[PDB]
Amino acid sequence: REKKKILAERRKVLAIDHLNEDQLREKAKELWQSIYNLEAEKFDLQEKFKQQKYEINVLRNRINDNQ
């Protein structure tokens, strides 16, 4: 029984557990659209992380050799 855990899971109940079957139709849609868009942001954020490890390593080579 955590105060911040009980309140967190209530966000579903306040947003979903109360209304229409025809709005739940066109609301579960936008809930997936948000995941897909965030899953796209997460893919691009991962790819940029790969390129930075190369960018950083090339810098570590340059900073060393130029000394």
Partner 1 sequence: SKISASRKLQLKTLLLQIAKQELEREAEERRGEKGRALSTRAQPLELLGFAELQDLARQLHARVDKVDEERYDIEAKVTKNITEIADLTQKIFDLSADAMMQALL
Partner 2 sequence: MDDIYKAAVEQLTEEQKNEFKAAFDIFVLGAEDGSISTKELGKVMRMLGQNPTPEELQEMIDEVDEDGSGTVDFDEFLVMMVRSMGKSEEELSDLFRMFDKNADGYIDLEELKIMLQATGETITEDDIEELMKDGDKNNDGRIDYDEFLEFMKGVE
- Helices (H), ranges, 16-67: 21-65
Is residue 10 involved in binding partner 1 (CB under 8 A)?
no
Is residue 52 involved in binding partner 2 (CB under 8 A)?
no
Nearer to partner 2, 9 or 65 (CB): 65
For partner 2, how many residues bind (rule: CB under 8 A)? 8
Is residue 58 involved in binding partner 2 (CB under 8 A)?
yes
Residues sharing a CB contact under 8 Å with residue 16, sequence separation 6 or more, in sequence order: 24, 27
Q: Shortest distance, CB of residue 13 to partner 1, whole angstroms?
A: 8
